[PDB]
Enzyme design. Structure first.
Site, PDB file in Angstrom:
ATOM      1  N   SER A  82       0.836  -1.218   0.000  1.00 24.70           N
ATOM      2  CA  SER A  82       0.000   0.000   0.000  1.00 24.70           C
ATOM      3  C   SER A  82       0.860   1.253   0.000  1.00 24.70           C
ATOM      4  O   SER A  82       1.787   1.354  -0.817  1.00 24.70           O
ATOM      5  CB  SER A  82      -0.895  -0.033   1.229  1.00 24.70           C
ATOM      6  N   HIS A 129      -1.003  -1.003  -4.832  1.00 21.86           N
ATOM      7  CA  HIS A 129      -2.424  -1.039  -5.110  1.00 21.86           C
ATOM      8  C   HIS A 129      -2.942   0.386  -5.120  1.00 21.86           C
ATOM      9  O   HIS A 129      -2.350   1.288  -4.529  1.00 21.86           O
ATOM     10  CB  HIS A 129      -3.167  -1.903  -4.086  1.00 21.86           C
TER      11      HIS A 129
HETATM   12  C1  LIG Z   1      -2.867   2.820  -1.839  1.00 19.68           C
HETATM   13  C2  LIG Z   1      -2.129   3.671  -0.822  1.00 19.68           C
HETATM   14  C3  LIG Z   1      -2.073   5.118  -1.279  1.00 19.68           C
HETATM   15  C4  LIG Z   1      -2.769   3.558   0.555  1.00 19.68           C
HETATM   16  C5  LIG Z   1      -3.672   2.344   0.764  1.00 19.68           C
HETATM   17  N1  LIG Z   1      -4.994   2.757   1.223  1.00 19.68           N
HETATM   18  C6  LIG Z   1      -5.507   3.972   1.020  1.00 19.68           C
HETATM   19  O1  LIG Z   1      -5.466   4.550  -0.062  1.00 19.68           O
HETATM   20  C7  LIG Z   1      -6.175   4.634   2.220  1.00 19.68           C
HETATM   21  C8  LIG Z   1      -7.105   3.643   2.923  1.00 19.68           C
HETATM   22  C9  LIG Z   1      -6.518   3.108   4.202  1.00 19.68           C
HETATM   23  C10 LIG Z   1      -6.030   1.815   4.272  1.00 19.68           C
HETATM   24  C11 LIG Z   1      -5.486   1.326   5.448  1.00 19.68           C
HETATM   25  C12 LIG Z   1      -5.426   2.126   6.565  1.00 19.68           C
HETATM   26  C13 LIG Z   1      -5.905   3.412   6.510  1.00 19.68           C
HETATM   27  C14 LIG Z   1      -6.448   3.902   5.334  1.00 19.68           C
HETATM   28  N2  LIG Z   1      -6.893   5.819   1.809  1.00 19.68           N
HETATM   29  C15 LIG Z   1      -7.013   6.870   2.614  1.00 19.68           C
HETATM   30  O2  LIG Z   1      -6.251   7.103   3.547  1.00 19.68           O
HETATM   31  C16 LIG Z   1      -8.169   7.779   2.331  1.00 19.68           C
HETATM   32  C17 LIG Z   1      -8.623   8.646   3.308  1.00 19.68           C
HETATM   33  N3  LIG Z   1      -9.648   9.473   3.097  1.00 19.68           N
HETATM   34  C18 LIG Z   1     -10.205   9.411   1.890  1.00 19.68           C
HETATM   35  C19 LIG Z   1      -9.745   8.553   0.916  1.00 19.68           C
HETATM   36  N4  LIG Z   1      -8.729   7.719   1.123  1.00 19.68           N
HETATM   37  B1  LIG Z   1      -2.998   1.255   1.780  1.00 19.68           B
HETATM   38  O3  LIG Z   1      -3.231   1.682   3.174  1.00 19.68           O
HETATM   39  O4  LIG Z   1      -3.678  -0.068   1.715  1.00 19.68           O
END
Ligand SMILES: CC(C)C[C@H](NC(=O)[C@H](Cc1ccccc1)NC(=O)c1cnccn1)B(O)O
Ligand SMILES: Nc1ncnc2c1ncn2[C@@H]1O[C@H](COP(=O)(O)OP(=O)(O)OP(=O)(O)O)[C@@H](O)[C@H]1O
Ligand SMILES: Nc1ncnc2c1ncn2[C@@H]1O[C@H](COP(=O)(O)OP(=O)(O)OP(=O)(O)O)[C@@H](O)[C@H]1O
Ligand SMILES: Nc1ncnc2c1ncn2[C@@H]1O[C@H](COP(=O)(O)OP(=O)(O)OP(=O)(O)O)[C@@H](O)[C@H]1O
Ligand SMILES: CC(C)C[C@H](NC(=O)[C@H](Cc1ccccc1)NC(=O)c1cnccn1)B(O)O
Ligand SMILES: Nc1ncnc2c1ncn2[C@@H]1O[C@H](COP(=O)(O)OP(=O)(O)O)[C@@H](O)[C@H]1O
Ligand SMILES: [Mg+2]
Lengths: 349, 192, 341, 192, 50, 51, 51, 50, 50, 50
Positions: B92, B117
């Site tokens: 991530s 991802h």
């Molecule tokens: C792909 C990269 C940029 C990050 C991935 N997930 C997100 O995009 C994260 C989701 C997440 C996953 C795990 C823990 C906390 C938040 N997206 C966000 O932080 C987020 C927050 N507010 C609106 C839209 N997206 B990763 O954490 O799986």
């Protein structure tokens, strides 16, 4: 006319094994000194005066710093005074003053001053006049920092007034006025903690992934050396800039230490073959045993001085037994060096 | 389970002995609180010496995007070159921080996996369709910003990042070297 | 005789390259000293104007004073403070810097009541906290208190042989004192500077630490923290800010002065019969490595001995015409660029 | 309860006294936070002496695979030999870390359990079938990598690891020495 | 002491042993003087055991 | 030419290191000094110096 | 049996504190000695630099 | 420092070189010496405000 | 202070000098020298209350 | 003290024979010089009791 650096190094090669970069330096630097003395009495003719270009010899203990200077003493045609910075003090304190290493150069020219103005002083163990901090010391440091402060007028060249040191006080035999602008200073030291300073400069940490951690099998170590590594070692920055040349003595590997045993003039196995000859006993080393002595001498970690430390825990039961009996040949085998406490091959009458 | 050497003096656990050797550790998920921790360490190590390389260890499952770009900006901001080392996983957001190291200084252990991802919303964001049009233009902006970030650091086109991060792309260490996320796979240094 | 301060500096420019603020401060204070003498021989009880030079090592403090030696035709002692002890102790005493003046005056005392006594390394005679193993630190505060009377100006008996004592008045004797003051660069940064932390805060990398903080940011309270007693500063109202040498001056040190560095090495190789040439890219490549050393113009020798180390071993055993040291020999490892006949 | 004892100013538990004797302790399940602890300890003890060996005690039910390969690669990375001793159990990842020690230096107590099995997923991973065929290519990547890892260290074929880790192959200490996971069933040193 | 061990031209004060810079000295060469040195080394058997 | 081969003699307290040297004094045909390294101090400092 | 009274001059620097006391000593042509307390060390030895 | 501010029979060495022979010292009492001490107080008004 | 407070042949370095060797000392007997030592002992008020 | 407590040819660093400026040292053999040493060893009765 003058001995070329290939001819100076060829003399040094007869005594000193290894040490290729620190034999080009001290053959270059002695040749430039010889050219400074020829340019100092003759020669448009380019009216420029030559500065001395002093030498700092790095490199670990027992690896041919003092021995490379004692060899350089044997063919110099120029006054040489080997001197020790561990006996030097500030002016005002009880030890030898920094102008008594310059008396030793005058005493090396038998009393002559004009030849001693053209000489070489070798100040041995100048890593021991270094401070214990990169900062100014809280104490006075009369034997350390204050020697470096007292030497730097002599290193850059001055009208030094050498005390004659044969009377009750100083002006009792009319100070020898010497000019040290053409006196070459080859200073040397082991600089034991300097290797840790060089890794902390370049960005190499000593912990973690991709960061070099050093095993004992390794015993960038004194190359890529800068004056800021020596400022942080304890040499004051005024002292280092007056030492432009770094000779870069290195740790002797196993292939060098095999040849140090056999090849030089006063070689180490020649000394023990000489010792058993006084017992009427021929001493033979198989070449597998000489490689085994040098294999253990890099674990010893004290340079070519460690070769003498191995050969007297190997020949110790031999040198005890043999003067009480009658033999001819004592064949040191490889089985008694790496496998300690093995009685070697005997050949009696 | 961690040996702390406690003491009125410094405590000195192994993470202090990482931080004194300029190794910032990211082993938890990238939430706000961890991102806050990393940025505080990135600035402190910049102020201790801005020329020595900061090493960042990444064993993170990833996390939030703004917490990602908080760490990302601070990694890119500081004068010190950031050496990123992947431990086990850089999934991530943490794969983006792994690619965010200084070129030539992005490392991974041989059996470390790198998971890239596209951004996802944690759970369901409710609201009116005008609220959700904003939230979807937001995650499309987060997706585009992640792709152009990985475009800058892997040397690829952002459309190539878009096609590859359409699903979970798990790269190994050698596959992340070929991709551009790390620069060297760390060889084992054991003397045996 | 009174040379103008523009004319003092234009002689200093012939030898000393760079150090433009320190050459103005020397040339003005030397001019203010001799003009105050000449007006006194023909007042608002004017200042003494003794000079405290301080800067990075190798950047020209001694070389500024040796250039003032070659100009003024006024007796100029070149005395060092690394041998000065208190009276009644082993070593050189404080009044010997007056004897070095009349040795430069050919024992004429009235020209030595107008001369310049240059004292080198007064960072040595700064106070250290006393080591409990030395039996009376004699080289610090007590040398420095023994200078206080003669920096202002007193009658002083001078022992010869460095029979009767020679009385020298030092009220009209200029004192230029010097030293690198290696810890003082950190002490000033403890006051005018901050270890900058965070976003938008100047953190000042090690390349920018190698600048000077002695420009206008040195104070007497920084010198007392170094070890200089507060009266000794008050006898030195003029402080010549010797600076670190930039890339532009370190190029000009290599070729332009009388005993310039590349002229010293071309003489070393034409004694072998071989021309030595430098591209201008090479001399700039030598000069920007000297800033990383921090040893000033003395570090330019450390580079050129290291660059020319393999050829000085090779060339005298050969028959050649010239070699052109290029920028691939200081930045990269040494090409052997020699040209055979 | 875990007591302490004051050395000399400093207060040390037995885990400190183990760690100062180059003993890393894996006593909990291999998750990220434990793997992060072990890797920090492996790098500290390598920096203290990279020639004095590191001992790893393993009383662990095993855990995450990326946390496994994080410890695994760090054990293989450090210059020091790793002496793995199994204490009670080494299950799953812990048995792979038990086999990951230096050959000749892998020990187990006589009543220690060595449990090897193929990787699993805790609970159900939801998703579209394109998401699931990637998660299943991933668990096959994890299974193949674990069987390759046990093939480097037990000296066995990875196809034989695959047949044995079909179910829980639970080994005693003597059965793990014959298998190749340990090298020495550590005999008792009681004076009586 | 290392200059004394390896062999040097050491200026020895005949005053009694307390060095002070001015006097006639006694020049001795220690390139043939054997230096048996000894010590208890009370904390060394732990260092060897490591 | 031959070199010194100096001796570093190690042993626990009261087990005979000085007593080996005091015995070796009694036969030696060579001048013998019992020095003491604690009595010595670096040059420039009070106490005895290594000469 | 009268007892003298000493002056503690407070305040920040550069306000003319020593110039008050120097002028006041030049008025009565009594001696005047500028000293600092940084001339005494915060590591001991104080008692011979007070002299 | 407060011993001289209060008044004491102090033995002053005439210079730094007179701490070598130790028989001659300049006697002075500070029982009638005025002491005008001064500081550099810039963090005192905090306590004055207090 | 123990042998001083009870009585000993104490060697006293003169004014300016320290206890270094080759220094002349003053042999005083502190057997009949009375010692009135004193202090504030501010923490002792808690201790006597204990 | 340990060289003195066992016996050594020590030389006293000040005052060898009422201070002649040559040979300020006189020899003494401490081999037959009995040493009685003493002290409270106040924390030792807590050590012996262990
Ligand atoms: C792909 C990269 C940029 C990050 C991935 N997930 C997100 O995009 C994260 C989701 C997440 C996953 C795990 C823990 C906390 C938040 N997206 C966000 O932080 C987020 C927050 N507010 C609106 C839209 N997206 B990763 O954490 O799986
Ligand atoms: N390159 C070499 N070739 C032959 N012999 C050597 C060499 N280097 C060292 N030796 C041997 O090692 C011994 C010690 O050498 P030296 O006196 O130079 O010590 P050193 O390493 O300079 O010690 P330090 O570094 O502490 O000054 C000499 O007797 C010499 O015979
Ligand atoms: N500004 C300069 N212009 C020209 N040459 C210079 C300059 N600075 C230094 N040099 C050259 O380098 C030499 C060393 O400079 P100098 O002796 O003035 O150093 P320094 O500042 O006195 O050093 P230190 O602080 O160590 O005493 C000079 O003799 C001269 O050859
Ligand atoms: N092997 C031995 N045989 C006979 N007597 C011994 C032996 N070892 C020690 N002694 C006796 O012990 C006494 C002390 O010996 P020595 O002076 O050598 O002390 P030491 O152990 O060397 O002390 P340190 O190790 O502190 O130098 C001597 O008087 C000697 O008589
Ligand atoms: C067999 C060895 C390699 C590892 C064993 N455990 C696993 O396989 C663990 C169990 C687990 C934990 C959390 C989420 C999903 C699965 N597998 C993983 O770590 C894992 C993680 N992501 C995808 C696939 N598997 B064992 O119990 O340590
Ligand atoms: N109020 C003032 N009137 C006249 N001169 C002053 C005054 N304040 C400062 N000065 C000048 O400042 C110099 C030193 O000031 P000083 O009294 O030592 O201040 P401080 O005690 O705060 O250091 C004197 O030479 C004096 O000429
Ligand atoms: Mg100078």
């Amino acid at each position: 006319e003058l001995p070329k650096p290939a001819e100076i190094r060829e003399f040094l090669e007869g005594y000193v094994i290894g040490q290729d970069t620190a034999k080009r330096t001290l053959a270059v630097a002695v040749y430039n000194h010889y050219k400074r003395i020829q340019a100092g009495e003759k020669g448009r003719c380019e009216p420029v005066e030559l500065t001395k270009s002093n030498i700092l010899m790095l490199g670990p203990t027992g690896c041919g710093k003092t021995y490379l200077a004692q060899t350089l003493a044997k063919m110099l045609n120029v006054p040489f005074a080997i001197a020790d910075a561990t006996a030097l003090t500030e002016a005002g304190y009880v030890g030898e003053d920094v102008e008594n290493i310059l008396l030793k150069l005058i005493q090396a020219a038998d009393y002559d001053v004009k030849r001693a103005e053209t000489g070489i002083i070798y100040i041995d163990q100048v890593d021991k006049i270094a401070r214990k901090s990169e900062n100014p010391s809280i104490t006075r440091d009369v034997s350390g920092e204050g020697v470096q402060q007292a030497l730097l007028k002599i290193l850059e060249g001055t009208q030094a007034s050498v005390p004659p040191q044969g009377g009750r006080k100083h002006p009792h035999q009319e100070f020898i006025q010497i000019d040290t602008t053409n006196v070459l200073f080859i200073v040397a030291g082991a600089f034991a903690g300097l290797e840790k300073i060089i890794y902390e400069r370049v960005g190499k940490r000593g912990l973690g992934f991709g960061a070099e951690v050093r095993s004992k099998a390794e015993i960038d170590h004194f190359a890529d050396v800068m004056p800021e590594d020596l400022i942080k070692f304890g040499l004051i920055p005024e002292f280092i800039g007056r030492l432009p040349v770094v000779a870069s003595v290195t740790n002797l590997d196993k292939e060098s230490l095999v040849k140090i045993l056999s090849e030089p003039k006063n070689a180490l196995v020649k000394q023990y073959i000489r010792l058993f000859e006084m017992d009427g006993v021929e001493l033979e080393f198989t070449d597998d045993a000489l490689e085994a002595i040098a294999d253990q001498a890099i674990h010893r970690g004290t340079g070519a001085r460690g070769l003498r430390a191995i050969m007297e825990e190997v020949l110790l039961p031999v040198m005890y037994d043999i003067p009480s009996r009658d033999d001819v040949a004592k064949v040191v085998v490889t089985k008694e060096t790496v496998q300690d406490n093995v009685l070697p091959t005997i050949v009696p009458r | 389970i961690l040996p702390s050497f406690i003491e009125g003096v410094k405590e000195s656990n192994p993470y202090n002995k990482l931080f004194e050797e300029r190794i910032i550790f990211l082993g938890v998920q990238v939430d706000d609180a961890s991102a806050n921790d990393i940025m505080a360490q990135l600035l402190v190590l910049e102020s201790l010496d801005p020329d020595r390389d900061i090493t960042m260890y990444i064993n993170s499952p990833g996390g939030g995007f703004t917490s990602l770009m908080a760490i990302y900006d601070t990694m890119q901001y500081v004068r010190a070159d950031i050496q990123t080392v992947c431990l086990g996983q850089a999934a991530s957001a943490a794969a983006v921080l792994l690619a965010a190291g200084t070129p030539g200084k992005r490392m991974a252990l041989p059996n470390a996996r790198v998971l890239i991802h596209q951004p996802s919303l944690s759970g369901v964001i409710q609201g009116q369709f005008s609220d959700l049009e904003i939230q979807a233009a937001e995650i499309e902006r987060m997706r585009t910003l992640m792709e152009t970030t990985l475009a800058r650091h892997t040397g690829k086109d952002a459309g190539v990042i878009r096609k590859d991060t359409d699903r979970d792309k798990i790269l190994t260490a050698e596959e992340a070297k070929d991709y551009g996320i790390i620069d060297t796979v760390l060889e084992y240094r054991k003397l045996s």
